[PDB]
Design a protein around this ligand. Structure first.
Ligand SMILES: C[N+](C)(C)CCCCCCCCCC[N+](C)(C)C
Lengths: 537, 531
């Protein structure tokens, strides 16, 4: 300990940690990377709820990110930045339950609001160690204390035989909850305020934030929530108990595992990690995009009912939420399975290809429902136009899966006492390597929120760097106060709360805040109010 | 004896009357018999041609109006009285009217034939709004209008029977059409240039002559104003007509087909009219009990099947709608609606209204209509709900059937011109909220604003002149554009890709694209697949 930097030695419940002094553009920050918050969920602990980390002795080195949770690695376009930046940047292992802390350097004098980030990746991938999730900018410029955790994905995190003890389901949400409990117990050691914790997340991260909102034990572990482009309701974020059982049973069958729950899980346990990954996609009921095999399950425990039933009957009075979407939520998903679509051409499609694409984007639709979608999205002045058909296909996937479930969520939370703020994110990064026709794709607001444009060596424009500063300001103000608006700041335009009466939300882009009314309101009535009844009768 | 008012037709000699038009004299020949009176045992039967007469037949007045229900919703109000019979009611009513220039056209003149509307249960060729003198005088047109049988009298069918075969009101129209072929040259008309035009049930009539072979050699061009033979109200199936005829008979104490019609023929006219409205299967508006039947004869198949398979290559058609087709219909049955208040309604009332406006809708289809017409920023605003109700009725019954017809005729070789009429008459007595109601362009097409004693504005007099010019240019050439006027924009043909149509209002022609295209996709393409 003699010669170490005194500002980097911290004790937590399990013992002593040494962090690292990192350079941010404006000055130094403190990082504590790869803190274990759980016993390594390996061997007989696969599929199992996580157990609190046993204390170590000596000084645990927390200067590097730890292993990423075992997952499928995207290889659709090897070498391409657009996909590689989401791929694991550390070795895969089932031994992966670690979290990461960024704080100002020196650590703040007085209790500081805490941001907890939950990554996305369809519940089958992701990592808290990705460059785009780097907490140094928020820690340095805003003084934030930032935490992000690994949680198990795919089979390891969500394979379930509901009702059993050996694979209860939702263990990936349980990992996240453990990390939240860790933050309650330990964040003060870092100068964080456990009495002011904001969750934020994008995609499946956002659906996770959503599920902590809807799960009572989690509710005492945070105060405010930010859902970016993801919701707990909707067609992909959860499965019924029955459907989870079918999928788990089929996967077991496909890897050579024969009847009752104990035998079946013991055999899966047993199989090499890569084996479960190699077969994970084979268990989906239909040809489809935006569907993932192993997701949170409606177990009657972590989720005591469907998310739809819970948002409809909950009282959300003590709650402040920020929710929003990007302009082109669906575009990037199309190249993963809709024929006619590719990142290396303009992807102009015919009416045939559009109808075939709808059956893949809306796998649960009968021929009547699919016709309804195709008719709703047709441009009747130019019904054969391949540019519009291509943008229709993107909007279908984007609206059904993200925009309309978000609009629905905002509407329910507002109606039942929550303070809600809503945005559509509309700026395409000058650095984006996906094609122009993809517009502003899923995930590309992250990036600005974490303030990467502030790095002089990333080649963003000055306007983009200013924009990043604005977004960090809204996000941390929300964390700080429950309100994204700057209280001191006279000259600026105000971001109003979303309400059922006025349906007000804001545009985030290079221009000042513009207030808009109704979030794809006509189309969301189609998806949220009409389409369900069609699929019912 | 004025020689310009003496004409010899095939049935004998006729004498008309010199009328005053603001510009000058016209010749009128009113009450020319074109058929034997369909009385007694000819009730419900095809018309037979009129027997020859002797001496000189006095054709100087409108004859009886065909027996029909008379609207008593608002007694003595102009808005409804102007559509009511203005002559005596009678089963003896098969008379037609002819206006020509004075003196009579020197050279063969294109002929316009007017077929009145009135839901197939009413109307007369004798209403002031159908006055042919203006078109005759200003544009030099030969105009013909005929009475045809309506209600039980024109349309009660026992399909398959000798004695009530159905569609006899259309056969009356056809007989008047053949009569024009045989006689109009005596008036200086050109039997080689005949244009049908009609509004509402009369537009549906025109459309049926387009879809019926024997009619097709009696006219060259057609105008369909605010109605079509396709759509939910213009035809019934053979089975549905038999159901209705049998029910009417039962309601009047009658009694095999022969015995049932025999007893119906013994019933006074008014006893039949009395129970006319009790036979509809559902409480509804924009539905009429006795309309053309798909008999397998006049109509060899449903209008939809016929427009989908027809070759319409030698045909020109003008079609259009007024801006607020459904509004006038709401006060005739929808709870919450009245001409004497602003008719602000609730959401509950909108759905109750949809059940009456779209009577064939299931709960789910009714929900689809309601969801589609809702304004999602103000889902409770009473003004929008009221206007939506009007749009549901207008789109479902008129606008979207018109769009379908236009699309099909153009896809299959017809030259098609389409319009939306958007001028509300300064003289109109319906309330402002009704906008521009069903029927209210006829006024202008006939050129009534050219009458100084009616005091339309000067701008309306000019407007009326433009529309008379369009309509007769079209009758003259199958194209409403003025073949010597070198002025923009030209009214372009409606085609299935560009979907160009024009708005007729006080301002010059504006070309628009897509006739409520999104909404018509809902009615024409989704909603049927739903039921
Ligand atoms: C591998 N298969 C074909 C079986 C499934 C791939 C699932 C699609 C992944 C989403 C792509 C969006 C990219 C950007 N992010 C995820 C960051 C928003």
């Amino acid at each position: 300990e003699g010669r170490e930097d005194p500002q980097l030695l911290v004790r937590v419940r399990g013992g002593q940690l040494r962090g690292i002094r990192l350079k941010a553009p404006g000055g130094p920050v403190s990082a504590f990377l790869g803190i274990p918050f759980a016993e390594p969920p390996v061997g007989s602990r696969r599929f199992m709820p996580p157990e609190p980390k046993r204390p170590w002795s000596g000084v645990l080195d927390a200067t590097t990110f730890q292993n990423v949770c075992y997952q499928y690695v995207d290889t659709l376009y090897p070498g391409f930045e657009g996909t590689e930046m989401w791929n694991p940047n550390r070795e895969l292992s089932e031994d992966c339950l670690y979290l990461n802390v960024w704080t100002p350097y020196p650590r703040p004098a007085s209790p500081t609001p805490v941001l907890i980030w939950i990554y996305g990746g369809g519940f089958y991938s992701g990592a808290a160690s990705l460059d785009v999730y780097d907490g140094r900018f928020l820690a340095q410029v805003e003084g934030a204390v930032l935490v992000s955790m690994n949680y198990r994905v795919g089979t390891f995190g969500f394979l379930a035989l509901p009702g059993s003890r050996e694979a209860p389901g939702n263990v990936g949400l349980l990992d996240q909850r453990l990390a939240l409990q860790w933050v309650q117990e330990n964040i003060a050691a870092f100068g964080g305020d456990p009495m002011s914790v904001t969750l934020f997340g994008e995609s499946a991260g956002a659906a996770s934030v959503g599920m902590h909102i809807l799960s009572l034990p989690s509710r005492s572990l945070f105060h405010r929530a930010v859902l970016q482009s993801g919701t707990p309701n909707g067609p992909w974020a959860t499965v019924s108990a029955g459907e989870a059982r079918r999928r788990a049973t089929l996967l077991a069958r496909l890897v050579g595992c024969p009847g009752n729950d104990t035998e079946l899980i013991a055999c899966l346990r047993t199989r090499p990690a890569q084996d479960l990954v190699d077969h994970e996609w084979h268990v989906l009921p239909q040809e489809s995009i935006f569907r993932f095999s192993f997701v949170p399950v409606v177990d009657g425990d972590f989720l005591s009912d469907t998310p739809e039933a819970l948002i409809n009957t909950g009282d959300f009075q003590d709650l402040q939420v920020l929710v929003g979407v990007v302009k082109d939520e669906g575009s990037a998903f199309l190249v993963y399975g809709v024929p006619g679509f590719s990142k290396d051409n303009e992807s102009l499609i015919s009416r045939a290809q559009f109808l075939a694409g709808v059956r893949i984007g809306v796998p649960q639709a009968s021929d009547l429902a699919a016709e309804a979608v195709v008719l709703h999205y047709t441009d009747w002045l130019h019904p054969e136009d391949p540019t519009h058909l291509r943008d229709a296909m993107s909007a279908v996937v984007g609206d059904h899966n993200v925009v309309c479930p978000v609009a629905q969520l905002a509407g329910r939370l507002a109606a039942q006492g929550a303070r809600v703020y809503a945005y559509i994110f509309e700026h395409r990064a000058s650095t984006l390597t996906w094609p122009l026709w993809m517009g502003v794709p899923h995930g590309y607001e992250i990036e600005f929120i974490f303030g990467l444009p502030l790095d002089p060596s990333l080649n963003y424009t000055t306007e983009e760097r200013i924009f990043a500063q604005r977004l960090m300001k809204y996000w941390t103000n929300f964390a700080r106060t429950g309100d994204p608006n700057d209280p001191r700041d006279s000259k600026s335009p105000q971001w109003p709360p979303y309400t059922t009466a006025a349906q007000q939300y804001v545009s985030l882009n290079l221009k000042p805040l513009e207030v808009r009314r109704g979030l794809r309101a006509q189309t969301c009535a189609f998806w949220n109010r009409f389409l369900p009844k069609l699929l019912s009768a």
